[PDB]
Subunit: 330 residues, 4 copies
């Protein structure tokens, strides 16, 4: 046993739409325990030192902020900040926990604010967050009245970060992170809303990824899909001969308008492009006195409109679509 | 869904020795939902009408007796007795529930009294009851301070009877019945004590049955094995050419002394024969004014020392054995 | 048992590179016997009546032509033509067997002539023909000195047509048609040359299709890939919202230059675009011979408004030195 | 690849009743190639040096004897005897090949002579020989007109010895030894006759062993079952607390009358106890020729105190009419 998922097994056992998941999940998580550990056991020792127990104040509406009415002792706060610092890098965020500002590589808060007006109200919805990273967005979804959030992301570090935040939240059982790829899930048709965050361009079969997402949604459910794109019409699709912005294991970069056609082909309805930006809009940069060149490593220093390989600079599009059928329970 | 096993999934999820069982159990119980229903849906409608809620008094020490300080209304008691009567036949017992005496085909109470002095104290033990029928013995095991009892018996009727008694007990979660054969279990090595009640003579491979039981026990665990036997020494073993006492699907009927050697061969220790009787010792008979011949149908009316087929009349032996190794947690 | 593949089991048993295929093929063909029969048992009764025995003359070099020195009697020829006619429609060909001109609907011979100059010589090569139809091209490949041709095509009718031609060839064991999808093959790495003709645009995962093909080739083996394409550069890729040219179950239509990049990504070498043409083809009661899938006011477009069909042929090499 | 079973794949491919075996056999033999090799690759190099080609004279009727009209040169015979000697120990036999008397440790010929009168005539029968050792009896079965003999025995050495004899027979394809346990076979119902010799008492589930054997027989086929037994009636069955006659991994030793009931329960017909004998057999430096497993003060008992070994032979029929 590296990490016990007992609490998740208990939750899905008591949920009639998720109980079928017990037919495949336990073997997958048993196998994960015996796979390459890496740093997970060292990280787990730090997680175990983070103080247990409910905080006094939680904001998951306007930010992700945890605080006590009575602040912590200088010693306990130094130790807590030091434990959290060992889990670098923190990508999604940012977080404020007992005065400590976890200053993340991404402004997930700003992207959340720009997307939220375009999505169906989360009140009482079950949500699957695919490529959920450390789980930032699941807190924001509970903040909007989500009943249940399940995150899936295969990173050991993301599971530790999530469990550290969940522990500082007092063990909130409404959000969970499973170390899985979406391809490991059976056909649940169980969630009201599915988020796919930055996964499509890593998949050799982009249409199989879109069908896998459709298969997790109830009748009339909603998909929010974010991926890297290029500018162009319905027939613009980049596939790089080697690496894209220094990344290996990259396949399809459709235009947003191309991606809209792909979603319609596999059977989604009411497809809208709701946001498109250069990725730097939502990135933070370490920009101190020691900084050499300010340009990210993945951009050409001679022309920051291009990657080091000479492709167009990264752009992120966010689409919202509907699975066919009437959405039940309002 | 015919019957939801959520509560069992929750229990084994929170138990580190039983959690591995989630790797095979859920698919088996999913398949059971879709197998031939028979009368289970009609029976379930009666179970659902049995009154919910804790009784005032429970004796599971000296009997299995349930009672309220304030007795039930004449109407509610007639309805309850009528519901319970639809689940005939009640084999293991007997039971007394709110004044209603469930007068069973077997005196499981007397056999329990004769065996109890020969078994390791049940206090804080986990127990697997193989061939558990309606689950009578699991109540008696909790009565002796067992922490946990799991019953396995593939009969639809036995699951209903057990759930009716469990409901009248106020939903006691320390005992459960799974509709499984012992051959469906993986190698758990999780129980302190295993009971095998009247299963061995139904198994084509009696040694595989004994190894399956050894595989469910912890180091130093205890087996109590009951089966049908013949008189004789270590080389006396009946295999009938067709039926035995009118029963189809019957294989090996060793002498008790033969069975002791079989247990030693597959690796058990400290094997003791603790009880041997004609089966009629522990049977009840309907013996009223209308009775034609008093002899059970399976006995020869011309010679009640023999079956109708001419084999020796049924005898039951009870053996107690130890899995090798030191038993941990005292 | 609808059809006995004993002869193919025997062939791959005696071949070192194909024997591993026996680990999965027999259960797949057992399951195929038990699937929806349709007309296959009736068709098989016609195949059983087709005359057995070697013909005197075989041309598989310039055509697919079978003849006896001494021609058949008018009765035997009427019966044989009647049996062959029961397997309509014949798409790939044409075939001429003992004077009977089989009623083929495509000129597979012209396609073959346009391909042939661009491929590595077939002498002593083993060839996998994916989407092989009734197997016309496998005969032409044997005609060019191929050691062995295996065709992959799930149609009941294609297997009957193939076995009818094979029987009239005297049971030639150097060509075989298996009713399988390419996705059912394991990683054989057994063939010198693989043809994928008209398959890629039917596959939901086109890169998994290219990897499937690479996985059937030996070191230094050759892929010939023909598919429907659009004009444009390396980022031109059409996916329809529903049908393309009135075809259902269609996915990716890259430009040939896009397809070249896809093949390089998957690990192919020396990728060449070898041929590219706008497709043409009727009933004589039709006003014109424009397919129904073309826009009648602009035949450069489909009725759905996309660019009209174009076929490209690419040739590529799996990395490594090609042995014997 | 340690040993190529291509010839067996080809044989069962061309046999209607055995072709279904291709659904499971190839993966099992692939896994066997990759299991613990031991000496098998060294042994195979000796097998490869044994001279190929048909001998002039074969007796498989009265013995197993191979000879040329023109004998081998003293050099060729020394080399061949040296190669055969590398596969020690030879248990079943004896064998005489080109004048060389193979050093067999059992008189399988006497066993064969005692069995033969009790079995249905072998002419044109297919036979499964379970626990066949180096395959001595399969030669004798062919000698009696058996169409086909398949031996089932997991020993590396047994397969080498068999293939050495088969090679000296000129590659006779009517007998084959597969390195499998009986539990690995599917339900073939393909053989006219099944032999199970010295296997039952090694099986933890003896009734599953009897059902396994019934499952390999055609309608009306015959089982010959030989095992170790005790004296007694239908309820006499020995199971040891640990070893029987110093053998580990042993389970049930029924009386022959008990075994007859077991066969009837499992659904066999016309069950006959045909033969029953107390077994005998040394090094000449031994005080006596009592096996070490016998009690020296009472050789009617094992050293463990059980009854001494006895062998019984039973013959039974699967229900149904036996075709051709």
């Amino acid at each position: 046993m590296m990490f016990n998922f007992a609490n998740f097994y208990q939750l899905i056992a008591q949920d009639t739409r998720l109980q079928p998941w017990l037919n495949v999940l336990p073997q997958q998580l048993t196998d994960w325990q015996n796979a390459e550990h890496g740093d997970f056991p060292r990280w787990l020792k730090a997680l175990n030192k983070i103080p247990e127990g409910a905080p006094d104040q939680i904001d998951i509406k306007h930010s992700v902020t945890i605080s006590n009415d009575t602040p912590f002792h200088q010693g306990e706060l130094k130790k807590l900040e030091s434990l959290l610092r060992t889990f670098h890098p923190w990508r999604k965020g940012p977080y404020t926990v007992h005065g400590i500002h976890i200053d993340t590589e991404w402004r997930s808060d700003w992207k959340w604010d720009r997307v939220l007006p375009h999505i169906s109200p989360l009140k009482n919805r079950s949500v699957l967050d695919v490529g959920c990273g450390n789980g930032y967005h699941m807190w924001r979804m509970l903040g909007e009245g989500a009943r249940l959030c399940v995150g899936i992301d295969p990173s050991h570090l993301f599971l530790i970060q999530f469990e550290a935040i969940r522990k500082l939240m007092g063990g909130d059982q409404r959000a969970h992170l499973l170390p899985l790829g979406i391809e490991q899930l059976p056909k649940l048709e169980a969630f009201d809303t599915v988020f796919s965050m930055g996964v499509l361009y890593h998949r050799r079969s982009p249409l199989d990824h879109l069908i896998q997402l459709k298969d997790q949604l109830v009748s009339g459910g909603e998909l929010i899909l974010e991926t890297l794109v290029i500018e162009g019409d319905e027939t613009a699709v980049l596939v790089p001969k080697e690496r894209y912005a220094q990344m290996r294991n990259v396949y399809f970069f459709p235009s947003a308008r191309a991606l809209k056609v792909w979603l319609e082909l596999v059977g989604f309805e009411d497809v809208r492009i709701v946001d498109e930006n250069v990725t730097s809009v939502d990135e933070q940069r370490t920009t101190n006195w020691m900084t050499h060149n300010s340009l990210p490593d993945y951009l050409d220093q001679n022309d920051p409109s291009k990657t080091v390989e000479g492709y167009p600079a990264p752009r992120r599009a966010i689409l919202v679509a509907k699975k066919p059928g009437h959405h039940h329970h309002h």
